[PDB]
């Protein structure tokens, strides 16, 4: 039918959405502002106040301020996933281990799997990050969800997205993920896909893919050009590269950028939707590469502005949000799903 949902397509989804009803705090409704890091000393730049007025998103949902706790919430996620044909949702994580963090990522495996969704994680730059209490978390969150009928395999493997792995020197990683080292997931009840962050040139990021031995690697950025790796130009050789050396590229497109609420000072990142048409050039860049995957940034990273979550017109006494202009809420929703279907028909 050119309908039913892409297992090679990955929509990085944020679970940290707080109401005071569920939650006790609107949290991450309410965030700090981010300081200039090249602003000087005694700046003191404040909080958005997370009230119905004033959110820390340059756009506003049509959800309104949701947790991400709430299961009538995460049945409209999943509604909203099947109408992108996106089959992968690829979870934050954080390692809180805090019991509302066990609750949250159940009740989204739940709710995934009422709709065929597949579970994913994305693993954080979580405090001392290491390759020894990775691996450990990678067998916490096999033995914990491996079984649950939601949860992703790619022929017979986890698959886990490492967020600024780079924080991680390869002769660490190699000990993790290279098939002979100390501490090694390859062979094991835990192996998986590790998919490591390509930020800048090949000539670093060649070495450090491979002698970190990673499976592959995605880009995240939803800027163009905010780096090497998201410059999507740059897309055809990352594959050819990929391609040569037996690794998974799994570049991130997105529908824009602005994140100026949290952080003012960081204008020069923004990149206008221009209604629809920044989306449309960077998902066409990302299957003529030639690729066998494709993640989405973002879902709803409501600060960073990538969201193709339905986002409404809203002005109020505290501040005029940008929403989808000439484009309806869904959008962003229905759209994917039109890239989806033009990719499945490249694969
Ligand atoms: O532009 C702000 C930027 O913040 C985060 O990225 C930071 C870091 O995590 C990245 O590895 C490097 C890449 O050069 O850039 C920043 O320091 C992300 O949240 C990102 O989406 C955001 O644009
Ligand atoms: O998911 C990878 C990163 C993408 C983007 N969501 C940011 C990063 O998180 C940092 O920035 C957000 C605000 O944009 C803060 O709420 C987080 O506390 C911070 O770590 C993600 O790591």
């Known amino acids: ?160 997205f490492i967020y600024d792995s780079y924080l991680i020197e390869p002769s660490e990683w190699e000990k993790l993920l290279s098939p002979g080292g100390s501490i090694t997931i390859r062979n094991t009840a835990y192996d998986a896909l590790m998919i490591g962050l390509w930020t800048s040139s090949p000539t670093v990021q060649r070495p450090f893919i491979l002698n970190a031995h990673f499976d592959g690697f995605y880009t995240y950025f939803a800027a163009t ?13 990352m594959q050819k590269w990929a391609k040569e050396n037996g690794k998974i590229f799994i570049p991130s497109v997105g529908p824009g950028y602005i994140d100026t609420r949290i952080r003012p000072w960081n204008g020069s990142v923004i990149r206008t939707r221009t209604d629809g048409q920044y989306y449309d050039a960077m998902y066409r860049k990302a299957i003529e590469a030639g690729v066998s995957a494709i993640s989405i940034t973002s879902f709803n990273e409501w600060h960073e502005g990538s969201q193709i979550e339905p986002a409404v017109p809203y002005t109020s006494s505290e501040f005029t949000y940008l929403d989808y202009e000439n484009r309806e809420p869904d959008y962003y929703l229905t759209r994917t799903a039109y890239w989806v279907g033009k990719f499945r028909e490249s694969k």
């Open 225 to 237: 050009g905010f780096t090497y790796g998201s410059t999507p130009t740059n897309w055809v050789s």
């Open 1 to 160: 039918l050119g309908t039913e949902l892409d297992y090679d397509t990955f929509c990085f989804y944020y679970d940290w959405y707080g109401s005071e009803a569920i939650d006790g705090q609107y949290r991450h409704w309410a965030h700090a502002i981010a300081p200039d890091p090249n602003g000087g000393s005694g700046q003191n730049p404040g909080t958005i106040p997370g009230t119905q007025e004033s959110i820390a998103s340059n756009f506003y949902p049509q959800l309104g301020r949701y947790s991400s706790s709430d299961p009538n919430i995460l049945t409209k996620h999943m509604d909203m996933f099947v109408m992108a044909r996106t089959g992968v949702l690829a979870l934050t994580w954080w390692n809180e281990q805090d019991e509302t963090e066990a609750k949250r990522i159940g009740l989204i495996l739940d709710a995934a799997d009422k709709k065929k969704i597949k579970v994913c994680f994305h693993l954080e730059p979580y405090p001392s990050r290491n390759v020894q209490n990775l691996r450990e978390n990678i067998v916490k969150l096999i033995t914990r969800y491996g079984n649950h009928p939601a949860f992703y395999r790619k022929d017979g493997k986890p698959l886990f």
